[PDB]
């Protein structure tokens, strides 16, 4: 199970499916999970945290892609910047 250091030391590929992985439960199955949440909340300076993963929902894009598209959007207006590529 990969984390990181930074959010910044990987992409926005990586991120999405580093949220998939919370969203699949890909880990250690339930610990990994807990911390695949908190380096989502640590990772990317973001807001949400707890908001951007799973109770955003009502007309919140909360999809395991739309999630990471919160980010997208407070680290797009926020003009974040900071992960990587490929």
């Known amino acids: 199970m990969e984390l990181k250091h930074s959010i910044s030391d990987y992409t926005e590929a990586?991120?999405?499916?580093?949220?998939?992985?919370?969203?699949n439960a890909d880990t250690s199955s339930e610990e990994e999970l807990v911390k695949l949440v908190t380096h989502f909340?640590?990772?990317?300076?973001?807001?949400?945290?707890?908001?951007?993963?799973?109770?955003?929902?009502?007309?919140?894009?909360?999809?395991?892609?739309?999630?990471?598209?919160?980010?997208?959007?407070w680290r797009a207006a926020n003009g974040k910047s900071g992960f990587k590529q490929g």
Do not use: A, R, W
């Open 14 to 23: 990586e991120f999405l499916q580093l949220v998939t992985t919370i969203c």
């Open 41 to 73: 909340e640590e990772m990317t300076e973001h807001p949400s945290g707890s908001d951007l993963i799973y109770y955003p929902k009502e007309g919140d894009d909360d999809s395991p892609s739309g999630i990471v598209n919160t980010v997208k959007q």
